[PDB]
Amino acid sequence: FVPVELATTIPVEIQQAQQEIKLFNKWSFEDVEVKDASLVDYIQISKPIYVAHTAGRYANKRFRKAQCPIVERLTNSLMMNGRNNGKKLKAVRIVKHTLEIINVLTDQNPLQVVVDAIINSGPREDTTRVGGGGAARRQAVDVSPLRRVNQSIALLTIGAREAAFRNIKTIAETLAEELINAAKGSSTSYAIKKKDELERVAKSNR
């Protein structure tokens, strides 16, 4: 759509309405459906980042961490454990692969699926070692939104990590699968299970 005439060679896709609509590396950053009420500026969406790799300041204020794209945050979380500290390019690649897998399996815009997974993993009721003398007493504490989101993301990544530790399954595919499980259908994913267990524990305590 509308080829721009240059002396330098530019691909057809770039020429097409990607100049017009600025959504992702060829994915929909629209749709915009958060299942829980509001939750925006805690799960970012909105800002149509092209590739989940932005170098900015997201530790230098209290809540500014929220303005990280969710995909980017996922990538960052993936970037973990010795063999992979730094190497964000790899993480980005893995995320792309995951997205592709999601697209292939049960269709849909993968971003929405990711969002769903984030929503449906994370816990409402949590436990803190309050003490009561330092002993095994844990009062049930409800979780703040941003923190909860972060926790969910971490557990998702953890699931993938667990899956990959000596297996044929490349990280990305496994991650995608677990994300899908988390979203809705089976709920036999690791992260979601863990979250549910935590919630149960919180319920049985005060």
Partner RNA sequence: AUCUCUCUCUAUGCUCUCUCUC
Residues 202 and 140 sit within 8 Å (Cβ to Cβ) = yes
- For position 81 contacting another protein by CB under 8 A, the verdict is no
Which member of 133, 136, 165, 168 binds RNA (CB under 7 A)? 133
Please tell me the count of residues contacting RNA according to CB under 7 A: 5
The closest alpha carbon to 202, from 146, 130, 135, 150, belongs to: 130
- For position 97 contacting another protein by CB under 8 A, the verdict is yes
Q: CB of residue 132 vs RNA: minimum separation in angstroms?
A: 4
Could you tell which of RNA, another protein, none binds residue 193, using a CB distance below 5 to 8 A set by kind? another protein
Q: Which two tokens stand for residue 41?
A: 């500026």
Q: CB of residue 89 vs another protein: minimum separation in angstroms?
A: 12
By C-beta, is 4 or 14 nearer to another protein?
A: 14
What's the per-residue H, E or C state across 39-56? CECCECCCCCCCCCCCCC
By C-beta, is 56 or 132 nearer to RNA?
A: 132
Angle, helices 110-121 vs 190-203, to 10°: value is 30
Contacts of another protein in 118-177 (CB under 8 A) = 124-132, 135-148, 168-170, 172-173
- For position 136 contacting RNA by CB under 7 A, the verdict is no
Residues 148 and 177 sit within 8 Å (Cβ to Cβ) = no
User: E strand or H helix at 126, and its extent?
Assistant: strand 125-127
Helix (H, G, I), strand (E, B) or coil at 147: helix
The amino acid occupying position 203 is K
Q: CB of residue 7 vs another protein: minimum separation in angstroms?
A: 26
Residues 176 and 96 sit within 8 Å (Cβ to Cβ) = no
Q: CB of residue 135 vs RNA: minimum separation in angstroms?
A: 7
Which member of 8, 63, 134, 165 binds RNA (CB under 7 A)? 134
Backbone angles phi, psi at 125, to 5 degrees: -105, 130
Could you tell which of RNA, another protein, none binds residue 204, using a CB distance below 5 to 8 A set by kind? another protein
